[PDB]
Design a protein around this ligand. Structure first.
Ligand SMILES: CC(C)=CCC/C(C)=C/CC/C(C)=C/CSP(=O)(O)OP(=O)(O)O
Ligand SMILES: CC(C)=CCC/C(C)=C/CC/C(C)=C/CSP(=O)(O)OP(=O)(O)O
Ligand SMILES: [Mg+2]
Ligand SMILES: [Mg+2]
Ligand SMILES: [Zn+2]
Ligand SMILES: [Zn+2]
Lengths: 338, 331
């Protein structure tokens, strides 16, 4: 396996002590993922900037101690605010997407370090189980799903396209449900905190893929004749499982071409929430951080999922929320009712 | 489960007696295939023209009797040459792509009808096994591969991009190998005449997918900073397996989100070669028709030990042949 990627990023990470071999695999992952889920572009500078947000994120996912968004320094030799400005300067969601990405670095770096055992990560894992709507919003930011919808419009110079909050919530729910359904087994093997069907009932995993895919086709059909909006649908379609066959990050080939097998720091970051946290996350962490249910089983710190275990009365509410996805979709996207 | 597709094609096939639910299924298939392997467009008119070629093709592929390019009239209520001009007028391969398509209609509708037993089809299936280069050229046309590369350029108003014969051959070999690797099982339980790894040793299936996927990543890299060539790469990448997860035609849900389980007629049509057959097919049929190898078993053809190894060396050779054809891979 040779690692192929544009030379623009081939001398990235000069300040960073990792094997050249590993820099290679990281650069390739950012290229592969960018080309899979933003398969069209008009703006090379934004494309590469997006690639650089994936380079930092890949590193954060497996060596949290190397990435500290709180230090407000160079991150891995990159000036993060300026990379974020190259990407989104003059798009509707610049400031909010800079928050989305910093939240992703903060949480992913904590999860992939000692700091996993700290207050921020405990509050976050607990806050995931607050509610099914809360789950999908945090999972959105963990997967950079609305960040990548914003990035796909930006990289095609669509600086005038945007969505309501509820519209982002439906689009990312479709994307994340589709991915999380295909990535189930892989996520379990890893002991993930962040996988839809650690929380959502396993017996709905096939039905929920099917429903999401179908709605996606329905919105796609409704958006016909506007080729700009194809960049949003393509993100979700290509992210929602297909990347498992396409990216060397995954083991389709290896598996013989088959699919299916310190409370101060918290309070300081909460005070920096306008900088570091997506709109609403600080509230999510204050309300859900300690658990919201007496029967749900929390751990004192964080071939099985590593998160909160929902009690069976909570799981019904999760089941029921999944089961009214079509109505919740048609609701924010009236064009589906037609 | 209901069928979703732009309302532009929702009243196609008014001349065709089929249940509205099968029309719906066919419209969905064409809409879903188009969006999957041509994920961008600028030219909606050309995009609908492409969907309609897929609509006709879906119907040829399961009821050959309902499609006859030979009869020189409208096909399933479409003016075929008109859909093809809507798609390709001003593009560099209009005449060739029209011949390409017509060959697909000719061979697909024979395969899926009584004509399956004719000289023309008998010669075509023997011609598949002439050589591995021949297989990939004919598989190309059976899958509308280069037809779809051309349509991806057209649907994005790239009226001036084209490839040499050699360059299409490699591009479609990438796509057809990736697709045929993944679709192996779907095709074994179908008894396809047209599957790569019925000819290519089955053990190279995994290697080949890997290597094709690796070359497609190398090509993608080389073509960086030229957004218009993404439409070529995107076709091969999304055609080559990922459609099994994305289109309802396939069984990803139903399999629990898993992948991996007369001679007068013949001579009349050769006489209409410039109209009905891709450049060179006539020859492939003339020379290949009665088999090429004393040892190979003809009547899909079953290859001898000598031939099977020659095909092996042709697969193993792929990187060299791609780099030969596309200097951009060497660097
Ligand atoms: C920047 C980012 C979102 C992730 C870094 C690794 C990358 C780029 C993976 C491919 C994109 C996916 C599937 C992200 C889901 S977050 P996940 O942790 O569930 O991804 P995984 O399933 O482990 O690949
Ligand atoms: C336009 C066309 C070429 C085919 C008509 C039906 C469609 C739209 C199928 C999907 C496109 C593919 C993968 C073509 C392979 S032909 P095959 O018969 O070997 O593929 P199969 O696996 O049976 O779909
Ligand atoms: Mg992960
Ligand atoms: Mg078929
Ligand atoms: Zn509970
Ligand atoms: Zn032989």
């Amino acid at each position: 396996m040779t690692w192929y990627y544009p030379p623009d990023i081939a001398s990235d990470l000069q300040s960073v002590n990792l094997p050249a071999e590993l820099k290679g695999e990281i650069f390739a992952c950012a290229w592969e993922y960018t080309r899979c889920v933003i398969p069209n572009y008009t703006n090379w500078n934004r494309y590469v900037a997006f690639m650089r947000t994936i380079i930092i994120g890949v590193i954060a996912e497996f060596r949290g101690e190397m990435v500290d968004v709180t230090a407000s320094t160079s991150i891995l030799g990159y000036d993060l605010d300026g990379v974020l400005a190259a990407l989104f300067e003059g798009t509707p969601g610049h400031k909010e997407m800079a928050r989305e990405y910093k939240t992703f670095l903060l949480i992913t770096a904590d999860k992939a370090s000692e700091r996993r055992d700290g207050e921020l990560f405990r509050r976050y894992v607990n806050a995931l189980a607050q509610s099914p709507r809360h789950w999908f919003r945090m999972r959105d930011c963990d997967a950079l799903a609305r960040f990548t919808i914003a990035s796909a419009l930006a990289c095609n110079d669509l600086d005038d396209i945007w969505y309501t909050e509820e519209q982002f919530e439906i689009l990312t729910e479709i994307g994340d449900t589709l991915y999380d359904a295909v990535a189930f087994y892989k996520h379990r093997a890893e002991g993930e905190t962040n996988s839809t069907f650690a929380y959502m009932p396993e017996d709905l995993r096939i039905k929920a893929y099917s429903e999401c895919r179908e709605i996606l086709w329905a919105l796609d059909a409704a958006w016909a004749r506007n080729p700009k909006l194809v960049n949003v649908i393509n993100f979700l379609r290509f992210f929602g499982g297909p990347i498992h066959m396409m990216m060397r990050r995954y083991r389709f080939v290896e598996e013989n071409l088959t699919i299916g097998k310190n409370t101060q720091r918290y309070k300081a970051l909460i005070g920096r929430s306008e900088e570091l946290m997506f709109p609403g996350l600080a509230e999510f962490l204050e309300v859900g951080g300690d658990g919201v249910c007496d029967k749900c089983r929390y751990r004192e710190s964080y071939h099985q999922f590593g998160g909160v275990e929902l009690c069976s009365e909570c799981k019904l509410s999760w089941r029921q929320y999944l089961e009214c996805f079509v109505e919740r979709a048609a609701d924010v996207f009236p064009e589906l009712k037609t």
